[PDB]
Design a protein around this ligand. Structure first.
Ligand SMILES: [Mn+2]
Ligand SMILES: [Mn+2]
Ligand SMILES: [Mn+2]
Ligand SMILES: [Mn+2]
Ligand SMILES: [Mn+2]
Ligand SMILES: [Mn+2]
Ligand SMILES: [Zn+2]
Ligand SMILES: [Zn+2]
Ligand SMILES: [Zn+2]
Ligand SMILES: [Zn+2]
Ligand SMILES: [Zn+2]
Ligand SMILES: [Zn+2]
Lengths: 257, 257, 257, 257, 257, 257
């Protein structure tokens, strides 16, 4: 039986919610440039694949993912001046999250995991949750609980980090189109990555401030913030298992049967 | 080479837009109950499959689809009180369309086809377009052109209509989870439809007015507005070819090479 | 005693609401071009006059009408590029309806009929209602009921249609400034129509899609979607009797004494 | 020929605007309690009647009036706790004014008089104007000019006031449902006023602060802020002539031929 | 012990609210031109100083002031075309007041004094209060009370008015950068005023209407609406005591121990 | 001469902007709990003090600070459930930033530095900037430049960090009410800190996800995320000199005289 809500009939869904401890998961991505070597829907594909695997293990369901996220920022996504990147205003993203939570509560659902795949989305997701929970309180609903996470934060093991980044970890922001995302894509969707097109530039560095309008000269030309030269399917498999296991465990802890 | 923007690199996309006459297509769907016999992502799947086929034929590109649409209305979707159906507020949907048009224009795109798959979305899509075009005009941009359509409107041939509706065409609104969508689903995604679960009821009838809050008693129990008993894979292939051909011709007329 | 809320004192209004089963009616119109032969406030005048007559028959009260409606669409009102047509943004119209419902509920009113006179308004009326009911629910109010109707939906009867259209009825999709509205106006406000100015053009037809910006060539030059050449006072009198009776009956059914 | 835009055809309106110096006028009122002796649409009726007379004199045109205004405030309209009073939120009213100006500018109009009839509306009218002018500036347009006025401000000449109040003038902060409005109504719409129902209470007084939620004890029971016992048709005729003359003169000064 | 919330620890604040009759005060100002002789933060400094002194007397606490207010209007602040003046949109100011009230309610506070210092702010503060109180009702909270005032309205004693305006009081609307504010500043922040720079022009007069876009020629060049030549420290000390005494008394009456 | 815009006359400000290279600085803070030992306006006081010193050095001007910021998050500010913390909604904060930029641009200013003092504000500052720059672009204005920075990011030097944290630096993630902010406060406003009230708890740690509603147990009781036991005046002086020099240098680089 599919773990995707979109692939269920309303009766199947109703039955699953009626069971009492149903966990729903919502992937939140973006359509964003990911360099010369990878496609632009990475931030949707990756959290969705992680949700799927986690859902399979814990008996959860996955909602249709958010395909468009917040504006790419230079220091975490290259910047919103790139072609292809198609970004929402903060109010739009926040409102989308708010509307979905309201609707899930209407269904009787009370457990939601928001899995972020695009660095910049976080605070707008946070505001959507706050506004939704506020509204639920107005309606006398106080037992709706939300867990929000970015899947990469579960990769904490020093040994794993060293396997992925032998020259040192440079932060999840500078990991845009680099070893982590590319390794995952190589493991899950190899046809959408062409490692031969990777441009092997040094990791992007920035001063301790930001400038707007975004100045394109300050982003590496290919749009990546770090090189995926050493990306590998094997690295992807390792990332995937670590994230899936860690998130599954976290969800079980927060949403026990 | 993929026709999906999400599956392209930013360089591939940039090149296609640079070519001068690039047509972009955006499927606009919903997560909505579709009776006992079909899944809930139909309104995304169908316009997306039609866009894919049209794009292959005319050399267009397809954007990631809108997964959540406007509130289901009793006379066209059963009603928003059903479980599973997960709907956006009008302002949210309108803003999503507006933001996407803004971004496509930033890229240099000037030709967009919005292909609706959920009856209720239309006027919010229209407002989204208007607000986006208003903003473009502020910047002196007047050459962005939009074609908006609901794919079923292209099925006009009496010979085809008579096969699907031998006792008479009763309207695209009453076509919710009926012969049209179900046939298309049998042709495209047979695993997501189980014809044996179809509840055969007489087509819903409604007074010449609407009542709110929605009264569940006025929608047939299963959520469908018409029976898909006579749906078939064959009918689906017929619908598909007529839509694809008709839409491709229309786009060629409105966006000539 | 007047049936118009505006013409009552607050004490008279209060007493009517205190009686317990008071029905309020709100006309929702537009300021919009209606060809060479007719004035622009038709969409307010017509529902207002119908509301007046219904209210007189059933003991209901009529609120001040909404004078400005949603943007005219080519296929239903000729298009918003015409001079004179003065339209609201969707959010504005939605908010107006929402605000009025909130206030009526504050008064203790619990029964509202929205009578639409401009096709394009419908979905924004729907959103206004939903948002208002959502708020009432937050305030513990679950007994506010709304009936929404477009008065022309009550001219159902084929026998009435034959009488009105002896040369053949071509459909409601082209009834903008045509025989239907023009006849009603001749019956109610003859000084606001000059039948000699009617341009007798062939009925408007359109492809199964819409284009924005709106292409003026696709609307008949006068702005009408069909010719009102055969309109008459007598046709208007019949429409008026039929509409008033049907709506009165429908309201009594939905809102009994 | 009518001075009301609603009563013109789009061709007639277009021709008036094409002439070059066309002045448009927009009445802005409210639906609000006006004591035991007068109806609730006073704030629409009065500015509309003054607009009509001014337009007749100066060759201007009058737009459909705004029927609903901002929330009644205790010190100026008795308070929004009264039944009957039906008020918009600030953003709704602001948005309505903004949308109308946008549309008038689209038509090619460049001269607008906003005539306020409800004290509380003023700042929201101001904001609506500013927001519409801001948008026009985006398009390089700086020749759209707006004159805003409350009609009573033209009846502040001490010699006139002496004629209207011989016993003594108590100030304007108390002229809600008092001698001023009542006299005008007696002159224009005698059928909507019943002087015998006037509750002759002493003028309302308040401390130099406001309290929310509004405390009904602090407003005179009937809702009026001053007694209309001395109101008369004669006083109304004087007020009317003084207002019309003064406003016609002011408009001719600001919008010369 | 400080009377400013910002200077308290959260434990100290919590204890003061826990006491049960805690009164909080919020100064609402503006950044606005105030002629050649005075600085631009006057509208924040003055109500803050009054709040401080009232708070000291009655045992209340003062919240961080709103530094930016609504757009300056010609007839009450010179006009928003002046340099330096930095104004918020109406929705922004309203929302700020609304958010703060919501938060104070969360803390358990139920008594708030909004002390306005910028003439134009009033109606947006009113709307913010109404929207916040509406929301509180949705959450079952009906015991939150707000007193709102403009501090100058407490200068009512004809003897005090005459000391300041021996030739006659023309209104708090024409008082911008004149004798009242300048005298208070001379008493409170003498280094921020240079009386030698006052431009002694005749008091601004205006017709009974407003014009937009704002016309700079209709405001006295220096930005003041009347001359502050006769301002003095002694007059400032008088004003200060009258305001502090009056407001303290008013708050003791409305928010008793 | 003051470096504070609020302490200047409009003529002085105009002249400074007229010079053509004027840099404006806007502190953006919060009202937020900062443990048992420190007051709640820290996030305003600190960036304001840094701005003042930087502006004195480089000839810039400082705008009135934003006193209220985005909702405290558990991992960065303890959480928005604490008393005293008074937070804005994201749209409110975004709108405030947007409005101020609009106004500065109107004055002729083209160089702005936003100095953030509250971690949570960052993304809403970014959105406010984007929306303001979007509006400027509608007016053909593309030369307004914004530099955004958080003052703590300028404490980079490992040698400085060694002086500040001789027993080892544990990271910026726990610096809410800890050594960094407390030391700065001891240097600038010693009367607002009472080091004896510091609760010497171990550094806060959290799992790689967040939970809403916020679980108060995951925040150390006092509200601090680390112990300020070792904070000192001397450490504050060092931080201050380092931050001021670094920021002055960065601004000179981006906005040369
Ligand atoms: Mn990304
Ligand atoms: Mn649907
Ligand atoms: Mn119409
Ligand atoms: Mn009024
Ligand atoms: Mn002011
Ligand atoms: Mn903070
Ligand atoms: Zn990515
Ligand atoms: Zn469907
Ligand atoms: Zn019509
Ligand atoms: Zn009135
Ligand atoms: Zn002032
Ligand atoms: Zn802090």
């Amino acid at each position: 039986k599919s773990v995707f809500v979109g692939e269920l009939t309303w009766k199947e869904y109703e039955a699953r919610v009626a069971a009492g401890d149903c966990v729903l998961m919502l992937p939140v991505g973006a359509l964003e440039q990911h360099g010369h070597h990878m496609c632009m829907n990475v931030d949707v594909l990756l959290p969705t694949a992680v949700c799927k695997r986690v859902a399979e293990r814990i008996g959860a369901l996955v909602m249709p993912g958010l395909q468009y996220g917040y504006k790419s920022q230079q220091k975490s996504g290259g910047g919103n001046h790139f072609p292809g990147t198609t970004s929402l205003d903060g109010a739009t993203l926040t409102g989308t999250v708010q509307d979905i939570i309201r609707e899930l509560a209407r269904h009787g659902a009370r457990r939601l995991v928001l899995m972020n795949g695009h660095y910049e989305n976080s605070m707008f997701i946070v505001e959507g949750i706050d506004l939704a929970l506020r509204e639920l309180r107005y309606a006398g609903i106080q037992d709706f609980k939300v867990v929000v996470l970015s899947y990469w934060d579960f990769v904490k093991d020093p040994a794993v980090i060293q396997q992925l980044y032998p020259e040192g970890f440079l932060g999840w922001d500078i990991e845009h189109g680099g070893v982590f995302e590319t390794s995952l894509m190589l493991a899950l969707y190899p046809d959408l990555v062409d490692l031969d097109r990777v441009v092997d530039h040094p990791p992007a560095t920035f001063p301790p401030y930001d400038v707007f309008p975004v100045d394109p000269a300050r982003t590496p030309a290919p749009g990546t913030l770090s090189s995926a030269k050493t990306a590998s399917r094997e690295k992807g498999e390792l990332i995937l298992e670590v994230c899936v296991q860690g998130i599954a465990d976290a969800i079980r802890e927060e949403f026990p049967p």
